Amino acid sequence: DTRPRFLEQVKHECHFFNGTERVRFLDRYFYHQEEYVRFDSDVGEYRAVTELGRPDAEYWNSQKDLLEQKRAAVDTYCRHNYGVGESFTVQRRVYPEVTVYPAKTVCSVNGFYPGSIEVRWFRNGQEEKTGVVSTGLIQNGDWTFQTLVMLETEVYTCQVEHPSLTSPLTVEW
Amino acid sequence: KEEHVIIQAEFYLNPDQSGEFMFDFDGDEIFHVDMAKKETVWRLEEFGRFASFEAQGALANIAVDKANLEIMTKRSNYTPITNVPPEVTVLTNSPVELREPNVLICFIDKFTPPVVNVTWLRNGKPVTTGVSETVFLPREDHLFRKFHYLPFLPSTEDVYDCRVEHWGLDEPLLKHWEFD
Amino acid sequence: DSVTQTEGQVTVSESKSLIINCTYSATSIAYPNLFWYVRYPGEGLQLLLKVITAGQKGSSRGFEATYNKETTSFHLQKASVQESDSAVYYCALSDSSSFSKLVFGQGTSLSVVPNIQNPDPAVYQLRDSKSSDKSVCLFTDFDSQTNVSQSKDSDVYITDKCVLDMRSMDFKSNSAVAWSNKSDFACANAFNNSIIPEDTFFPSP
Amino acid sequence: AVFQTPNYHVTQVGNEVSFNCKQTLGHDTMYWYKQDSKKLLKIMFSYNNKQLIVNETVPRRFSPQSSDKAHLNLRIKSVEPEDSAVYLCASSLDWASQNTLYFGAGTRLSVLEDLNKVFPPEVAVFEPSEAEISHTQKATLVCLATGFFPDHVELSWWVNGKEVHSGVCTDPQPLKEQPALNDSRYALSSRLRVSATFWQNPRNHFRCQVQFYGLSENDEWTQDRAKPVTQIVSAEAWGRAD
Amino acid sequence: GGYRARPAKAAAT
Ligand SMILES: *[C@@H]1O[C@H](CO)[C@@H](O)[C@H](O)[C@H]1NC(C)=O
Ligand SMILES: *[C@@H]1O[C@H](CO)[C@@H](O)[C@H](O)[C@H]1NC(C)=O
Ligand SMILES: *[C@@H]1O[C@H](CO)[C@@H](O)[C@H](O)[C@H]1NC(C)=O
Ligand code: NA
């Protein structure tokens, strides 16, 4: 209740650029929200981010087989875990559910994955670049996304382009 | 053009003595380990049919984090964490239609430490039927985020609220939602 | 869950090629790590080589082992064994999905036998420095292919073949010792259950 | 390095034993392995940062202990005959399966039903034969260590007060003097070969030494024969011109 | 497949 809190955080990060061709591994330790020591696969050893991690960086780098182990993490850890979940994470495709309806003072795209999406307003047969109000990408926390793209201004067509579909998705009103 | 980030995030918090272990993929949780039941909990049930994870390794990491926290607390001369109140947003999973099943989402963001009380209020009274919530999710600024869900049939006579209690808040925060 | 390797003792002449078989049972562990550990005489266990990536091969001290996916094997090979290679070799695995837990094979005892350039096989009687009545029989300087048979009499004791190296002379020799308390025991018949060279010297005392 | 103690230990069924181990590699994880009489290697415990993480259905007789990351001790509360084995201490960087394990020299435990079966060796040296000297100009001495139990011995040769290793061959395993009995006493032989001119110098001294590991001064002994304690038994010979 | 946890390291004392 009134007593103070103390938080330790550890984050082992794998950054993938174009699949597993280029991988960066980060072993990060935190006290509260401050990173005090870090292993960067681009560096090849532990380095103190602040003075708080200076004992750990010196101690860990001296351990038998430590540097050999952490330099292999891009293969034994990052590239491995990438392939374990590739079929339902990197290759996960859920196509969007699009509804177009007006409001009183709207193209609603819901339940799609991944987050990369592209939506335009056409009115009519020529895309309208003025008056577009986009809510932005919203993460639902359940491996689905949603977004609201509004237009206040005839055939109205909302065009959604998403990696789950081979061709654009159009909804008229 | 496949650019991704997989993060194994762990924390341990004193004196509450609570820790967690989860895998993040592009901001989504793959799984977490329930420390009490020593079980791997997949964010989606279908994930468990395609991959596996020995939850015991997570319990070993949390134990190391607990021992490391006591050491790091000594290194800082017992400097505590500074409270950060959260931003709370309430939205719906899909467009709202009368008498059509939907679910409310209470999104709690940018807060630390990872300890919150969350309560759904239907017409000012608590509701606990069919609610679900996620574990504390990591952020790039090393704060935390969290998702709470409440399925509901939208009606004109029902009004909902998400009451969030945090130590960084001087008073309970309450976000409102109702049908037009 | 299980590792199977060559059983028992393997005797190889120096400079011959060697293979020690090892297969593992891909049952509950879908992707194991494979190791070879070696224990030299009078020393502790230590890693020879390991392979943690399926497909790759590891090598050390002239040895070589390939993590064969399809064959589920990790055979240990060396093109020309040396006398210093005599040791116990253990094949091992660990499940790569959980805590390190080495599952060892039964172990293989390798004995690399040197070539005796100028054999001079003989059986000698040696007398105790303290009691002139006690004596032992020494079979020595025989070629490397000769096999010393253990005793099948409980009152006759015969040791295995031993290789000693007089380093200042650069001279190696095999030997075995036989002794007994039986009254009819003699060095002339002590090794009769072995097939020894026909030109073995039996000095008449 | 990985250090463990004791090297050898004999005790009676129902007694308590304590093994201790230390590693200086800076590692987080340490192990106890059991090497039985058939020389099959099987894991018993794994500790990571003073916390047990692996227990391979080990009888509650065994109580591992670690108050420090570099230390892992093992206590057997009431030994049974099947506990007779070599216990290996090991360490690894962490509990990741890819890590190499670094082992200690081992603790050789012998659990006996009756300590009256413990015997120190009798040692005798047999002088080179005149026939070998005339035939090869070399001289082989033979040492016999007989009648010891258990087989916790270390044999060494000493020439003119200095341990030698050249020209020495010791049996890798002892013989059972009565192979039918499971409690059979053992015999061990070793050879030392020198040039004939070295053996024929009366100023040269040759000594075979057998270090025996048996009971401690702490154990009680009611028998009439001497307490078979840890001791060195030696036999010697001087050079013979004729 | 099986996910591989990266083990947490014990801090220097
Ligand atoms: C991405 O990785 C693949 C790996 O097969 C490689 O062929 C390709 O050249 C890389 N770059 C691009 C732009 O695809
Ligand atoms: C640590 O904090 C205590 C209490 O606030 C203080 O007495 C002490 O001087 C501090 N030590 C350092 C090194 O700041
Ligand atoms: C949450 O509820 C518990 C139990 O009533 C209480 O102790 C705590 O102060 C509340 N607030 C927070 C932020 O945990
Ligand atoms: Na080779």
Q: Within a 13 Å sphere around the CA of B119, how many CA atoms are in the beta-carbon half?
A: 14
Class of residue D190 by CB neighbours under 10 A (exposed 0-12, middle 13-18, buried 19+): buried
Pocket test for ligand 3, best of B163, B165, B166, B173 (most atoms within 8 A of CB): B165
- Which of A60, A90, A120 is where one domain is finished? A90
Asked whether A101 and A108 are in contact (CB, 8 A), the reply is yes
Distance CA A60, CA B33 (A): 27
Which ligand minimizes its atom distance to the CA of B16? 3
Check whether A56 is labelled as a binding-site residue. Answer: yes
Q: Is D49 an 8 Å CB contact of chain E? A: yes
| Cβ–Cβ gap A8/B65 under 8 Å | yes
Which ligand minimizes its atom distance to the CA of A17? 1
* Coil, strand or helix at B77: coil
Residue B107's closest CA among B125, B92, B121?
B92
Q: Is E6 an 8 Å CB contact of chain C? A: no
Distance CA A96, CA A78 (A): 30
Measured CA angle at B136 (ends B133, B140), to 5 deg: 135
Q: Is D164 an 8 Å CB contact of chain C? A: no
- Write the DSSP assignment of C97-153 as a string of letters: TSS---EE---EEEEEEPP-SS---EEEEEEESS-TT-EEEEEES--TT-B-PPPSS
Helix (H) or strand (E) segment spanning residue A109: strand A107-112
Which residue has 């007006």 as its token pair? A102
Would you state the torsion angle of the CA atoms of residues C158, C161, C165, C169, taken in this order, to the nearest 10 degrees?
Answer: 80
Type of residue at A139: Q
Distance CA B105, CA B132 (A): 10
Pocket test for ligand 3, best of B117, B146, B169 (most atoms within 8 A of CB): B117
Would you state the torsion angle of the CA atoms of residues B89, B93, B94, B97, taken in this order, to the nearest 10 degrees?
Answer: -80
Pair A7, A76 in one domain: yes
Q: Is B7 an 8 Å CB contact of chain E? A: no
Residue A26's closest CA among A52, A51, A56, A47?
A47
Report the gap between the CA of E9 and the closest CA in chain B (Å): 7
Class of residue A125 by CB neighbours under 10 A (exposed 0-12, middle 13-18, buried 19+): exposed
Closest by Cβ to A12, choosing from B8, B137, B147: B8
Residue C148's closest CA among C200, C104, C109?
C200
Token duo for residue B169? 């808040």
Domain boundaries, chain D: 1-113, 114-242
Question: How many C-beta neighbours within 10 Å does residue C132 have?
Answer: 9
Distance CA E2, CA D181 (A): 51
Report the gap between the CA of E10 and the closest CA in chain C (Å): 16
- R_g of chain B, CA atoms, integer Å: 18
Residues of chain D contacting C166 with CB distance shorter than 8 Å: 138, 166-167, 193-194
Would residue C191 be called left, alpha or beta, if left means φ above 0 and alpha means ψ between -120 and 50 degrees? alpha
Pair A58, A101 in one domain: no
Counting the structural domains of chain A, the total is 2
Distance CA B83, CA B169 (A): 9
* Coil, strand or helix at A141: coil
Asked whether C196 and C188 are in contact (CB, 8 A), the reply is no
Sign of the four-CA dihedral D169, D170, D172, D176: positive
Sign of the four-CA dihedral A106, A107, A111, A113: negative
* Residues whose CB is less than 8 angstroms from the CB of residue D163 and which lie 6 or more positions away in sequence, other chains included: D156, D157
- Phi then psi for D5, rounded to 5 degrees? -140, 155
Class of residue A119 by CB neighbours under 10 A (exposed 0-12, middle 13-18, buried 19+): buried
| Cβ–Cβ gap A60/E12 under 8 Å | yes
Helix (H) or strand (E) segment spanning residue A161: strand A157-161
Resolution (Å units): 2.3
* Residues whose CB is less than 8 angstroms from the CB of residue C122 and which lie 6 or more positions away in sequence, other chains included: C139, C140, C141, C200, C201, C202, C203, D131, D132, D135, D136
Type of residue at A108: S
Distance CA A105, CA A172 (A): 21
**Ligand 2 centre distance from Cα of residue C137 (Å):** 81
Pair A27, A69 in one domain: yes
Distance CA A3, CA A14 (A): 36
* Coil, strand or helix at D134: helix
Report DSSP state, residue C84.
Answer: G
Distance CA A32, CA A52 (A): 12
Counting the structural domains of chain C, the total is 2
Instruction: Note the Cα B87 to chain centre separation in Å.
Output: 13
Beta-strand pair C108-113/C8-13: parallel
- Which of A90, A122, A146 is where one domain is finished? A90
Asked whether D73 and D66 are in contact (CB, 8 A), the reply is yes
Pair A100, A138 in one domain: yes
Question: How many C-beta neighbours within 10 Å does residue D24 have?
Answer: 11
Measured CA angle at D178 (ends D173, D179), to 5 deg: 65
Residues of chain C contacting B56 with CB distance shorter than 8 Å: 98-99
Residue D95's closest CA among B42, A142, B60, C133?
B60
Pair A107, A83 in one domain: no
Measured CA angle at B118 (ends B113, B123), to 5 deg: 155
- Write the DSSP assignment of A27-83 as a string of letters: EEEEETTEEEEEEETTT-SEEESSGGGHHHHHHHHHSTTHHHHHHTHIIIIIIHHHH
Which own/partner contact pairs does A46-55 have at CB distance under 8 Å and 24+ positions apart?
A: A46/A70, A52/B72, A52/B75, A52/B76, A53/A29, A55/B75, A55/E11, A55/E12
Q: With a 6 A CB cut-off, is A2 part of the ligand 3 pocket? A: no
| Cβ–Cβ gap A140/B105 under 8 Å | yes
- Number of continuous H segments (helices) and E segments (strands) in chain D: 2, 20
Helix (H) or strand (E) segment spanning residue B146: strand B144-152
Sheet holding B173-178, edge to edge: B125-127, B117-122, B159-165, B173-178
Token duo for residue B88? 């709370």
Which own/partner contact pairs does B119-126 have at CB distance under 8 Å and 24+ positions apart?
A: B119/B162, B119/B163, B120/B148, B120/B150, B120/B160, B120/B161, B120/B162, B120/B163, B121/B160, B121/B161, B121/B162, B121/B163, B121/B174, B122/B152, B122/B158, B122/B159, B122/B160, B123/B158, B123/B159, B124/B159, B124/B161
Residue D4's closest CA among D106, D136, D112?
D106
Say which experimental method was used: X-ray
Asked whether B86 and B46 are in contact (CB, 8 A), the reply is no
Distance CA C98, CA C107 (A): 24
Residue B162's closest CA among B88, B82, B97, B98?
B88
Residue C184's closest CA among C155, C163, C162?
C155
Chain D's closest residue to B61, CA to CA, is D48
Distance CA C120, CA C173 (A): 9
- Phi then psi for A51, rounded to 5 degrees? -65, -20
Residues of chain B contacting D95 with CB distance shorter than 8 Å: 57, 60
**Ligand 3 centre distance from Cα of residue B41 (Å):** 25
* Residues whose CB is less than 8 angstroms from the CB of residue C23 and which lie 6 or more positions away in sequence, other chains included: C3, C4, C5, C71, C72, C73, C74
* Coil, strand or helix at D237: strand
Distance CA C4, CA C91 (A): 8
Domain boundaries, chain B: 1-80, 81-180
Token duo for residue D47? 């500790």
E-assigned strand segments in B49-143? 87-92, 102-111, 117-122, 125-127, 132-133, 137-138
Residue ranges making up the domain that contains A113: 91-173
Helix (H) or strand (E) segment spanning residue B20: strand B18-25
Would you state the torsion angle of the CA atoms of residues C79, C84, C89, C93, taken in this order, to the nearest 10 degrees?
Answer: -70
E-assigned strand segments in chain D? 2-5, 8-12, 17-23, 29-35, 41-48, 51-55, 62-65, 73-76, 85-92, 102-103, 107-112, 122-127, 138-148, 153-159, 162-164, 168-170, 175-176, 186-195, 205-212, 231-238
| Cβ–Cβ gap C99/B52 under 8 Å | no
Pair C76, C31 in one domain: yes
**Ligand 1 centre distance from Cα of residue A41 (Å):** 21
The ligand 1 site (C-beta within 6 Å) comprises A 18-19, 21
* Coil, strand or helix at C86: coil
Q: Is B61 an 8 Å CB contact of chain E? A: yes
Asked whether C2 and C24 are in contact (CB, 8 A), the reply is yes
| Cβ–Cβ gap E7/D49 under 8 Å | no
Residue ranges making up the domain that contains C55: 1-113
Pair A85, A95 in one domain: no
Residue B88's closest CA among B27, B159, B163, B6?
B163
Token duo for residue D238? 């001087």
- CB interface of A with D, residues 37-96, below 8 Å: 59, 62-66, 69, 72, 76
Type of residue at B97: E
Pair A100, A119 in one domain: yes
Beta-strand pair D168-170/D62-65: unpaired
Sign of the four-CA dihedral C3, C9, C12, C14: positive
Measured CA angle at A137 (ends A135, A143), to 5 deg: 140
* Residues whose CB is less than 8 angstroms from the CB of residue C112 and which lie 6 or more positions away in sequence, other chains included: C12, C13, C14, C81, C82, C83, C84, C85, C86
- Which of C61, C87, C113 is where one domain is finished? C113
Check whether A60 is labelled as a binding-site residue. Answer: yes
* Residues whose CB is less than 8 angstroms from the CB of residue D224 and which lie 6 or more positions away in sequence, other chains included: none
Distance CA D71, CA D89 (A): 10
Encode C154-169 in three state secondary structure: CCEEECCCEEEEECCC
Cα separations in angstroms, E6 against A34, A91, B21:
21, 24, 11
Which ligand minimizes its atom distance to the CA of A18? 1
Residues of chain D contacting B63 with CB distance shorter than 8 Å: 48-49, 51
